[PDB]
Each structure stands twice: as structure tokens, then as C-alpha cells.
Amino acid sequence: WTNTSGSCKGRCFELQEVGPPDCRCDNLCKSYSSCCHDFDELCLKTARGWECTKDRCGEVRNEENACHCSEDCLSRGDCCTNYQVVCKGESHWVDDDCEEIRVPECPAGFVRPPLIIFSVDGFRASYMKKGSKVMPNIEKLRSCGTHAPYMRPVYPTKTFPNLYTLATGLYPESHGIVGNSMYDPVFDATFHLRGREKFNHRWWGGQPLWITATKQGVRAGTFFWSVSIPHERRILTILQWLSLPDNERPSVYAFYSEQPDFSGHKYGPFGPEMTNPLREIDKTVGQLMDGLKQLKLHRCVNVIFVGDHGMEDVTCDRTEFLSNYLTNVDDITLVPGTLGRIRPKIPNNLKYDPKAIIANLTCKKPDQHFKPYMKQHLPKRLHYANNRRIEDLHLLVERRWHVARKPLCFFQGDHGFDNKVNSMQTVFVGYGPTFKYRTKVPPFENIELYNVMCDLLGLKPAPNNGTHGSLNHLLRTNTFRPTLPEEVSRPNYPGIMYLQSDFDLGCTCDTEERHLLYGRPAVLYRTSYDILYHTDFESGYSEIFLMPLWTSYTISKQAEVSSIPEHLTNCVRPDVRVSPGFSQNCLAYKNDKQMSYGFLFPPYLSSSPEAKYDAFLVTNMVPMYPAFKRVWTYFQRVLVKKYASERNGVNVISGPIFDYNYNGLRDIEDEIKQYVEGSSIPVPTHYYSIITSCLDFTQPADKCDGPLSVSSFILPHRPDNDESCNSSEDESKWVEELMKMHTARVRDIEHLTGLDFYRKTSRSYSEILTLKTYLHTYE
Ligand SMILES: *[C@@H]1O[C@H](CO)[C@@H](O[C@@H]2O[C@H](CO)[C@@H](O[C@@H]3O[C@H](CO[C@H]4O[C@H](CO)[C@@H](O)[C@H](O[C@H]5O[C@H](CO)[C@@H](O)[C@H](O)[C@@H]5O[C@H]5O[C@H](CO)[C@@H](O)[C@H](O)[C@@H]5O)[C@@H]4O)[C@@H](O)[C@H](O)[C@@H]3O)[C@H](O)[C@H]2NC(C)=O)[C@H](O)[C@H]1NC(C)=O
Ligand SMILES: CC/C=C\C/C=C\C/C=C\C/C=C/C/C=C/C/C=C\CCC(=O)OC[C@@H](O)COP(=O)(O)O
Ligand SMILES: *[C@@H]1O[C@H](CO)[C@@H](O[C@@H]2O[C@H](CO)[C@@H](O)[C@H](O)[C@H]2NC(C)=O)[C@H](O)[C@H]1NC(C)=O
Ligand SMILES: *[C@@H]1O[C@H](CO)[C@@H](O[C@@H]2O[C@H](CO)[C@@H](O)[C@H](O)[C@H]2NC(C)=O)[C@H](O)[C@H]1NC(C)=O
Ligand SMILES: [Ca+2]
Ligand SMILES: [K+]
Ligand code: NA
Ligand SMILES: [Zn+2]
Ligand SMILES: [Zn+2]
């Protein structure tokens, strides 16, 4: 029971923690029906609106007014934000020239620059192009501070997963808010964006910034605002908190606006009706900045202007219905719209038939505007599988479309799609003493921001998925000095210890400086492996997994592609430096009716026939389904050379990935669940390739003076090409399309392999971290 007879007098929006029996006077009080009886009366005044007018200057204070224009308002901290402009002849902040802020200029008693996070819902990155004609305050923040052209949200590109990712630095699969709506089979309970279940703490994992701050003795303002509280009151409240005594004042603040998302849904992102909401948000930013100027804080505070996701054109006329594909959709529950998650209507309904459902949803219409995936087959870059709240069956929906269960307008916009889709990208601007001045930075992922906010606050971040230091380039100071991980396993460099006669493998056959331009990868786990040198490639061959952890080679732009001769079609040779016992055997391949093999270094790119025979080495071989071979051969034979030509040479590192439990992390031996028939040769779930060149394409890759350029992939190792609806055609019609979908960051590959790349370069470690987080999106 909470005793609501208490009073909020002297208590409005108090930061003090207040539990029942006591009644409350904060933002959460309504959700808990715990407000004091006079909360709305005392704490939510609205009289006279939010702006001083000339006729109010030097009024006697009426405590019934929403804000004040009396002479004493400044000392008390409750002036309307435009008081000085109207009453004292000052200028709005937006009308002042931009001046670099080289160090914080903070009033007496401020020990560090406060951080204010200004989040806007559904703010598409491209809205920024509207510029000062529509958003003069925001344009000033953007042009004078540090901005990215866009910031990449997490999937699904909806509000709750993204706001909580901003707060935690975690992927949804890790923080647990995997959708605006979700079912947890262990709780047997359902979470919705609207309603009370979401208030239960059991849903929310990781450690959000406000808790990190609090635990480390840094005080936070609210990070939740009741929907009933107007934006003007949110801003006034923040400004009032900033006026508090040194011993009460928070260091970090959050503002949230539900616009322009609401209007985007109603009118679509390109609607003329979007101008007004955008003007309104700008006016709010203006109130904040004017208010800060009144407090002499406008050159003291760090401000982050950040969105949760973008907005796409989606109308009623573009809806796929599952009832067109499946016979009884009333027996399933679909989380619908811009994504699909399917489970039986009755939890654990035993007659649920997922393989039959997937088969009926696979490439059944030529223009089909979604694609079904078991979650472990989703592109690894989405990091969307390792959580019990994520249904096994997922539908990745085409941009501009919806998926609905059945047929049984008012909306022209929506979001939720694949987070590399352009329309889903959102905004980032940082302005203030700790950010750079008039600086543009490359796009980056929202998972990175938690570390930076911790930096801006002097906090040590909880473990998260950001790569700390990858955003140091946004900052004038307070950068984090990263340190290189220590290698855990040093390699063996084995010479010949055997003879061809030594092997009974079933086969028949009738540098470091040049091929590892950025140094050899460090192995960050305990294992046993051999460095193997060759004319055309180097590898780290694992004695445990019976194949390379990595194969590294450089291909000049002028490099010549050769065919493989018909007599060498099935040539596999023993490797005299590696024991027969630590080798794969071709008998297993001849014997497995479903699994073939491929090579990490492609024979096609041999320097010479003598060298080409090295490519057929048993230690360059890896297990590949014929379906995958269609992809890999096209990549090895055609694409690698094409990249070399377009990029002026490339350095390639390729290898296997084992992630049977789909947690995005290197499997231990125990976790591997498939082997070549009759053998102990483990089967990769994916194959990766990291392709690097000189950012300045005029320089060849091996002669690169400056920054690097990288693209990487994590290709799923599957027994069929059902994912590619056009795979019956020549590889030139579908393989690249598949590869683009499975683009990846180097950092993703690092998690999955336990390797550390780019350890020997002429660039800073921070620059390299940025490179490792880069994602080539093909948008
Ligand atoms: C992104 O970054 C995160 C954060 O570093 C990484 O996630 C971590 O992975 C490691 C290694 O697998 C896990 O270590 C294990 O920890 C558990 C004990 O963990 C419990 O206590 C910790 C610490 O307080 C807590 O964080 C954990 O929270 C998990 O479980 C909660 C209760 O169910 C849940 O509410 C919360 O959301 C989180 O669930 C997620 O992780 C679990 C696995 O723990 C997973 O089953 C679930 O689906 C979610 O993904 C938990 O109470 C020990 O038993 C082990 O010995 C081992 O030490 C961390 O627990 C895990 N941390 C978090 C917060 O997820 C990711 O790997 C990284 N991803 C990538 C791709 O790099
Ligand atoms: C709810 C997220 C929980 C915690 C994360 C909090 C903060 C994250 C970091 C920085 C900025 C601060 C944000 C604080 C947010 C406060 C208000 C929180 C939720 C309001 C939710 C809301 O109003 O959603 C509106 C819906 O139209 C979204 O529906 P969709 O359009 O379908 O996604
Ligand atoms: C709920 O709150 C009211 C307000 O504080 C409490 O009312 C006071 O209670 C004591 C009774 O011993 C009186 O002396 C005061 O006159 C009351 N104050 C007012 C302004 O009403 C009430 O006690 C609380 N209910 C509880 C504790 O169950
Ligand atoms: C998958 O689609 C096929 C239709 O292509 C469905 O087959 C129908 O099933 C009903 C009863 O099961 C038969 O009486 C109809 O004759 C079939 N339709 C056609 C056009 O042949 C099948 O039911 C679907 N499977 C699922 C799981 O929805
Ligand atoms: Ca794994
Ligand atoms: K075979
Ligand atoms: Na196919
Ligand atoms: Zn949103
Ligand atoms: Zn929305």
C-alpha cells in the first residue's frame, strides 16, 4: 500500500528514492499509482503556457504559472526559457555565432561537464538534410559540433530494443529486450510496449547507464518520462535540476521525444506533413539551449542528439498475408509487420510443424516480399538469435512491406526492418567541450555509444558489445587508451618431420612480410597450431580442428587467374610438416555422400604450377557441402580477382567459423555437433573472408602508406541454397546477392574465431579499432 494522502509540496520531481508506504512525486509515480494526491496540481502547472511575453516581464510571482518571468526567476531556476530574450534583451542561442569550445566553461561548483542525452524517436538520418530552414537549432548543433552522416540502429529497428541498446551497449539478444513485444516461454508471460508487465525488472538485462552512473557515485536524472508530461515541462525539469545545489545536482540527464515517429507513421517519411513535427522538435531543442544559456551552461554541457531508428514508406497496399502460403494460420501467433516471429498460438503445441511451415514460405512467389529463416541462419551481423525470447522461426521482411497473418490508410510509415536498410538509419550529433568542433565522422553503430557516454562521465563501462576506443575520434579529450590483447597461444613453426610414405590418408594426386601485411593474427585462446609458409599463402593450421584457423594471402591487381587442370581435379596431397595423425583424410570425403571439400587458398590464383601444387595440400582443405561450393568456387575463382582489379590488389584472410550454439562466439570443442562422415573432422557453420586494401586506391595493397579499406563476410555453411531463390541460375545471378546479405565486421569475425587482427600496422590502435567495426553495407 502507498499512502497517497501525503503532499508533493517542496518535492516536485525530487530525485530522492521513495518507496511505499510513502507517496511519490516523480515520473514513475503514475505507472505505480503512487503519486501524492496533489502531484498533478503542484507539479504539473500549465497556466500561461511556456513562453514569456513582454507583458509579463517583472511580474509578481504567481506560483500557479507554468514558468516565471518575475525578477527572481533566475536565482530560483524556474524562468521560462525565453525570459532573458524577451525581458532582458538577450539573443536566442541559435542566433549566436558558433564558437569553438576548447574547454568547458562551467559556473562555480561544476566539477565536470554535465551530459544531456536528447533522444528523438523515428528520426531518419536523411531528415537532417532539411537543414536550418526547418531545424535551425539542430542544424547549429550538427554543423558546429561533431556529427555522423548516420548512426546504425540494432535489429529489430524498433523503439524498445534500440533505446535499451543505447543505454547498455548490448545487442538485444544480450540485454533481453528483443522486441517491443515478446513472449518469454520460461516466465510464460508477455511483454508489451503498452501496459504494466514491462515495469517488471525481470525483463531487463545488462547494466544501463543510469545504474552504471549510480553505482560509481555519479548522479543521474530520470531516464523515463510519463507520457502525460509535456515536452516543455520535461525541459523545465531538466533545467531546474541543473540549478540544484552542488550536493544535489545530477551529472547526466535524458530527454525523450516520441516525435517525429508518430507523424512518420501517420504520413510517411517524405510527407509534407513532416515539416511541422520537425519544427516542433527544433523548438524544444531551442528551449533547452536558451535555458542553458540563461544558466551560463551553454559552453559547459555536452549534448548528444540521437535517434533510435529511421522510418520507411509502408502502406496498407503492401502487405503479405501468411494465409496465402499456409493452410491454418489461426493456429499460429505472429509478431507481425516489418518483421515476423512465429510460434504456435498455444504454447508448446505439439502439432506445430516448423519444417512444413518454412517449406511453404520458401521461394513460393516470384516477387515474395519476405524471407523465412530459422534464427541460426539469420545473417550473423544482426546478432539476433541467442535468447529464449527470440522465436526459432523468423521472417526477414523486404523494406516498404508488411507481413500479416491474414486479411481479417491511417498509416503510411513504419520501421523494424534489417538494420542496414538506408531508411532505418538514424541520427547522431555531439556538441560541447568534450566533442570535436565542426567535425564529421564516419557512420557507426549505436552499440558503441554506451562506452562513449561512460567516457564523457568518467565512468567505467560494464561489459558490453561496443569496442572501446573505436569512437575516440569523436572526442577532443576523455578518450580511452585501448591496449592490445595478449596472445594466449604462440604457434609452432614445424619443418618437415615426415615422408609421403608416412601417410595413409586415402588421397591421390596424379612470405610472412608479403602475405601477412598487417601481421599475423594473435590466437586469444588455448590451443595448438602451426604456422605454415608457402609461395602464395600462409596459414595458421590447427592441430586440433584439423584445418587452418586462418589462411592469408595477397593478390596483386595484375595477378593472373589460372584454371585447374583436369588431372588435378581430385588432387589432394599430404603435408610433410604436419603429422598424419593431425591431418584430415580423403577417405572420409570419398565416403560421405553429402559432404565435399574446398580450399582456403584457391589453386586458381597460384603464382606457378609448382606453387599450385601447394594449394592441393591436405592442410589447405576444408569440408564444404556442394551447395556451398557453388558459392565458394565463384568467390575464389571470380570475385577475389575482381576485388584485386577494382581495389588495386587485395590481402585476403579466410577461415572457418564454428558457432553451433549461435551465440556469436567461438565454439569450444564440446560445442561442435557435426563432423565429416566417419571422421573427427569438424564442420564449420560458416566461412569468413576479410579483404583489405589501401584506402587510397592509387597505392597497391602491399605498398600502402596510409589508412586501410576493408570488407568482410561471414557466409553460412548450408547443405542447400534455399536462401537464394534464384540459385537455379548461374552463380553470376545470385552469389554476390547472398554475399552482400552476409557482410560482416572484422570485429564479428574476432568474436567468432578468438583471433585478433591488424596487430602490426602503421596506424594508431584507435584507428584500427574503427576499421574493425566498419561494416560494408552495399546500400
Ligand atoms: C555482448 O556483450 C555481452 C556482455 O559482455 C556478452 O554477454 C556475456 O557473455 C558471457 C560469456 O558467454 C556470459 O558469461 C556467463 O555468465 C554467466 C552468468 O551470467 C549471469 O550473471 C551475469 C552478471 O551479472 C549477468 O550479466 C547475466 O545476465 C544474463 O542472464 C540474465 C538472466 O537470464 C538475463 O536477464 C540477461 O539479459 C543476460 O542474458 C543473456 O546472457 C545469457 C548468458 O548468460 C543468455 O543465456 C541470454 O540469452 C542472454 O543472451 C546472468 O545473470 C555464467 O553462468 C557463465 O559462467 C559465464 O560467465 C555473460 O553472462 C554475458 N552477459 C550478458 C549481459 O549477456 C556477449 O557475449 C557479447 N556478444 C558478442 C557476440 O560478443
Ligand atoms: C523504453 C527504453 C528504456 C530505457 C532506455 C532509456 C534511455 C535510453 C537512452 C537515451 C535516451 C533516453 C531515453 C529515455 C526514454 C524515455 C521514454 C521511454 C519510452 C517511451 C516509449 C515510447 O513512447 O514509444 C513510442 C512508441 O511510438 C514506439 O513504438 P514503435 O514506433 O512501434 O517502436
Ligand atoms: C497517510 O498520510 C497522512 C498524511 O501524512 C497521515 O495523516 C497524518 O496522520 C497522523 C495520525 O497519527 C496525524 O497526526 C496527522 O494529523 C495526519 N496529517 C494529515 C495532514 O492528515 C496518515 O497517518 C497516513 N496514513 C497511515 C500512516 O496509515
Ligand atoms: C502448404 O501449401 C500446400 C498448398 O500448396 C497445402 O496443401 C493443401 O493442403 C490441404 C489440406 O492440408 C489440401 O486438401 C489441399 O488440397 C492442399 N492445397 C493444394 C493447393 O494442393 C498445405 O496445407 C500447406 N502446408 C501448410 C503447413 O500450411
Ligand atoms: Ca558459439
Ligand atoms: K563426397
Ligand atoms: Na534455391
Ligand atoms: Zn522508436
Ligand atoms: Zn514507430
Curated annotation (Swiss-Prot):
A motif (Cell attachment site) lies at residues 76-78. Isoforms 1 and 3 have maximum activity from 45 to 55 degrees Celsius. Optimum pH is 8.0 for isoforms 1, 2 and 3. The keyword Nucleotide-binding does not apply. The record marks 772 as: Essential for catalytic activity. It is found in: Secreted. 1-(9Z-octadecenoyl)-sn-glycero-3-phosphate binds at residues 159, 180, 261, 415. Disulfide bonds join 8-25, 12-43, 23-36, 29-35, 52-69, 57-87, 67-80, 73-79, 98-144, 106-300, 316-409, 363-725, 507-586, 509-571, 694-704. One of its GO terms (cellular component) is plasma membrane. Binds 2 Zn(2+) ions per subunit. Transmembrane segments: none annotated. Glycans are attached at residues 3, 360, 465, 726. 1-hexadecanoyl-sn-glycero-3-phosphate binds at residues 159, 180, 261, 415. Residues 517-779 are annotated as: Nuclease-like domain. Zn(2+) 1 binds at residues 121, 159, 308-309. GO terms for molecular function: alkylglycerophosphoethanolamine phosphodiesterase activity; calcium ion binding; dinucleotide phosphatase activity; lysophospholipase activity; nucleic acid binding; phosphodiesterase I activity; phospholipase D activity; polysaccharide binding. One of its GO terms (biological process) is chemotaxis. It is an enzyme of class 3 (hydrolase). Residues 749-770 are annotated as: Required for secretion. Expressed in brain and adipose tissue. Induction: Up-regulated in adipocytes of obese-diabetic db/db mice. Residues 94-442 are annotated as: Phosphodiesterase domain. Changing residue 453 to A: Reduced lysophospholipase activity. The nuclease-like domain is most probably catalytically inactive as residues that are essential for catalysis in the DNA/RNA non-specific endonucleases are not conserved. However, it is required for the stability of the protein and the catalytic activity born by the Phosphodiesterase domain. This is Autotaxin. It comes from Mus musculus (Mouse). The lineage of its organism: Eukaryota, Metazoa, Chordata, Craniata, Vertebrata.
